[PDB]
Amino acid sequence: ATSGFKHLVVVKFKEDAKVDEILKGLENLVSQIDSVKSFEWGEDNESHEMLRQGFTHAFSMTFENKDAYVSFTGHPLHVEFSAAFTAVIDKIVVMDFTVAAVKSPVVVAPAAALEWSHPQFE
Amino acid sequence: SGFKHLVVVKFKEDAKVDEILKGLENLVSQIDSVKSFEWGEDNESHEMLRQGFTHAFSMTFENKDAYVSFTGHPLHVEFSAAFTAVIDKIVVMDFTVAAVKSP
Incomplete structure (x- = not known):
């Protein structure tokens, strides 16, 4: 059961990075690119540092499949964003x-429930 | 889109990863407060960016309170204790999830 292909980025920003502008930039990038099916993010600067290792932000983009992701990585907006992003990260x-969809409150991977019904042709 | 618990890991060389993942799938399937669970494996993308991590998984909860309760669940505590022994890092x-774009 797969719900799609995920591009997951976990980062710590440089001390002087303008995080709000970077986030606005990501919001703008994802809105302009149809292949990005979902985009979410969060910040954690509260949890244990021995387990978080100083990372503060996680961003998750989902695509219909690996091919769509590979195409997105060539998209000029993403290439430009990438280059700028390199400059503002510490790590x-x-x-x-490919996402293994194990549990969800709503359907995210319908085909997995029905693929057994494909006829046997041999 | 609720509260997420995200884990990125590298397993010890001898770990039985398939069994470990089956174990986690079994855990989450039995605890109502876990709304979503997914995972994946990446041992293909660039090492200078992945830093050797190979697996990611995430659980989602309705809010932080539900997550905090779940961390006290005895089965989760026991799972975590054993999991400690099979990870390299x-x-x-x-x-809290900021949902920016969805279908």
């Missing part, structure tokens, strides 16, 4: 993966 |  973890 | 983040 980063990037993860790109 | 971990990043954990817990946050």
Whole structure:
């Protein structure tokens, strides 16, 4: 069961980074690019530092599949954003993966419930 | 879109990752306060950006209170204790979700 392909970025920003402008920039980027199906983010600067390792922000973009993600990485707006983003981060973890959809309150991966019904052609 | 508990990890070389993940799937399936659970594996993207992490998973809760309660759940406590022994490193983040775009 897969709900799509996720581009996950966990970051710590440089001390002087203008985080609100960076966030406005991400909001603007995602709104302009149709291939981005979902975008959410959060900040955690409260939880334990031995487990968080100083990371403060996590951003999650979802795509219909890996091919759509690969295309997005070539999108000029994303390439430009990327270059600027490099300048304002202290550290980063990037993860790109097919999502295993295990539990959700609403349907996110319908095909997984029905693929058994495909006829056997051989 | 609620409160998220996000974990990014690298497992020890000898860990039985498939079994560990089946265990976590089983945990979350039995606890009503866990609204969503997903995970993935990435051992393909650039190492200078992934830093050797291979798996990510996230649980979503209706709010921070539900998450805090869940962290006290005995089965979660026992799972976490055992999980400690099979990881090389971990990043954990817990946050209110700002939903910016969705379908």
